[PDB]
Design an enzyme around this catalytic site. Sequence first.
Site, PDB file in Angstrom:
ATOM      1  N   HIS A  61       1.290  -6.469   2.180  1.00  0.00           N
ATOM      2  CA  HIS A  61       0.038  -5.739   2.383  1.00  0.00           C
ATOM      3  C   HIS A  61      -0.840  -5.684   1.133  1.00  0.00           C
ATOM      4  O   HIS A  61      -2.039  -5.415   1.225  1.00  0.00           O
ATOM      5  CB  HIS A  61       0.271  -4.345   2.980  1.00  0.00           C
ATOM      6  CG  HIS A  61       1.203  -3.480   2.191  1.00  0.00           C
ATOM      7  ND1 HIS A  61       2.563  -3.451   2.418  1.00  0.00           N
ATOM      8  CD2 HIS A  61       0.966  -2.581   1.205  1.00  0.00           C
ATOM      9  CE1 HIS A  61       3.125  -2.570   1.609  1.00  0.00           C
ATOM     10  NE2 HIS A  61       2.178  -2.028   0.862  1.00  0.00           N
ATOM     11  N   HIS A  91      -1.674  -1.328  -7.745  1.00  0.00           N
ATOM     12  CA  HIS A  91      -2.051  -2.326  -6.756  1.00  0.00           C
ATOM     13  C   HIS A  91      -3.542  -2.167  -6.513  1.00  0.00           C
ATOM     14  O   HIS A  91      -4.168  -1.236  -7.020  1.00  0.00           O
ATOM     15  CB  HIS A  91      -1.287  -2.130  -5.452  1.00  0.00           C
ATOM     16  CG  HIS A  91      -1.491  -0.781  -4.841  1.00  0.00           C
ATOM     17  ND1 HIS A  91      -0.742   0.328  -5.160  1.00  0.00           N
ATOM     18  CD2 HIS A  91      -2.416  -0.356  -3.945  1.00  0.00           C
ATOM     19  CE1 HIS A  91      -1.217   1.370  -4.469  1.00  0.00           C
ATOM     20  NE2 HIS A  91      -2.237   1.010  -3.715  1.00  0.00           N
ATOM     21  N   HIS A  93      -6.894  -2.844  -3.447  1.00  0.00           N
ATOM     22  CA  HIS A  93      -7.291  -2.964  -2.048  1.00  0.00           C
ATOM     23  C   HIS A  93      -8.601  -3.740  -2.218  1.00  0.00           C
ATOM     24  O   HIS A  93      -9.386  -3.431  -3.126  1.00  0.00           O
ATOM     25  CB  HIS A  93      -7.575  -1.603  -1.410  1.00  0.00           C
ATOM     26  CG  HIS A  93      -6.380  -0.706  -1.353  1.00  0.00           C
ATOM     27  ND1 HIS A  93      -5.515  -0.639  -0.284  1.00  0.00           N
ATOM     28  CD2 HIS A  93      -5.880   0.144  -2.285  1.00  0.00           C
ATOM     29  CE1 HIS A  93      -4.540   0.230  -0.598  1.00  0.00           C
ATOM     30  NE2 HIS A  93      -4.724   0.728  -1.807  1.00  0.00           N
ATOM     31  N   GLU A 103     -11.513   1.853  -0.877  1.00  0.00           N
ATOM     32  CA  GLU A 103     -11.074   2.796   0.136  1.00  0.00           C
ATOM     33  C   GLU A 103     -11.960   4.032   0.048  1.00  0.00           C
ATOM     34  O   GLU A 103     -12.480   4.505   1.055  1.00  0.00           O
ATOM     35  CB  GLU A 103      -9.605   3.131  -0.071  1.00  0.00           C
ATOM     36  CG  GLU A 103      -8.744   1.902   0.087  1.00  0.00           C
ATOM     37  CD  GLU A 103      -7.330   2.236   0.425  1.00  0.00           C
ATOM     38  OE1 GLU A 103      -6.692   2.989  -0.334  1.00  0.00           O
ATOM     39  OE2 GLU A 103      -6.860   1.745   1.461  1.00  0.00           O
ATOM     40  N   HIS A 116      -5.447   1.156  -7.798  1.00  0.00           N
ATOM     41  CA  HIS A 116      -4.695   2.396  -7.724  1.00  0.00           C
ATOM     42  C   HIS A 116      -3.510   2.349  -8.684  1.00  0.00           C
ATOM     43  O   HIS A 116      -2.621   1.509  -8.544  1.00  0.00           O
ATOM     44  CB  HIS A 116      -4.180   2.650  -6.295  1.00  0.00           C
ATOM     45  CG  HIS A 116      -5.257   2.953  -5.292  1.00  0.00           C
ATOM     46  ND1 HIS A 116      -5.042   2.807  -3.943  1.00  0.00           N
ATOM     47  CD2 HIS A 116      -6.501   3.453  -5.490  1.00  0.00           C
ATOM     48  CE1 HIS A 116      -6.148   3.219  -3.355  1.00  0.00           C
ATOM     49  NE2 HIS A 116      -7.056   3.619  -4.241  1.00  0.00           N
ATOM     50  N   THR A 195      -2.596   5.984   0.918  1.00  0.00           N
ATOM     51  CA  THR A 195      -3.478   5.404   1.916  1.00  0.00           C
ATOM     52  C   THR A 195      -2.807   4.351   2.792  1.00  0.00           C
ATOM     53  O   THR A 195      -3.462   3.687   3.594  1.00  0.00           O
ATOM     54  CB  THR A 195      -4.753   4.854   1.286  1.00  0.00           C
ATOM     55  OG1 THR A 195      -4.438   3.736   0.442  1.00  0.00           O
ATOM     56  CG2 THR A 195      -5.442   5.945   0.459  1.00  0.00           C
TER      57      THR A 195
END
Length: 257
Positions: A61, A91, A93, A103, A116, A195
């Site tokens: 992911h 990591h 997103h 996010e 994050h 999240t």
Amino acid sequence: HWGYGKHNGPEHWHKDFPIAKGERQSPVDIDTHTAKYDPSLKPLSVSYDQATSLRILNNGHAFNVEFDDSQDKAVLKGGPLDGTYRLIAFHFHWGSLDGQGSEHTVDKKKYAAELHLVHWNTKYGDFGKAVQQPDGLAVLGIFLKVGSAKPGLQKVVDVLDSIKTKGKSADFTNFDPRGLLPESLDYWTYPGSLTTPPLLECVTWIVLKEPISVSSEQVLKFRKLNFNGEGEPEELMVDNWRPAQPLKNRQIKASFK
Ligand SMILES: [Hg+2]
Ligand SMILES: [Zn+2]
């Protein structure tokens, strides 16, 4: 299991993780005009000088850069926090296009990506126990916008080829996370959650006001990663972000005016 696709995306998460519809879910939209300036908020203290990175991993992911957290090597304290929080991993997103990927949003504005840096409260001994407490985690969120290249990010960008598919990992030592911090440490803070499933509500979010810029070429490399494992149809890893959740009974505080 869960994912970001039409049939297993954020809209479906509640079926396996009922907490998805909880009272303190993340991310949220940060309305800069209703955020409360809190003058009692102390400045953040980021001590990453003795950080020890170990490896990078594609988990299906996102990709995780893991650190040695057996001692107070890289810690976060101050700000809205009580106690010391240890860096365990970080990591990102990101989106399929430059106009989406973050996010958290600021006045509904979306950024190209969001970093994050995950930390756990040392008072609890280990990460596993920290996720059983309402003040167990502290996550530093940093926005990424497309512009000039971030030198301190190239080392991560370059190793992505070796961890293209789900399950692959590579040694990744001597990486200094200080190269990913913006110039200013002004921030917004509010109580939220992870999240991604299990979406645990143990997070004190600290979102920095100032985004860092990365080049188009750097962000393009992120989009070449795969969700699938080796020997499976190619599913590019893009749009691995959750949409904003209702703020409910929460107040976002700002350390600046
Ligand atoms: Hg919790
Ligand atoms: Zn995240």
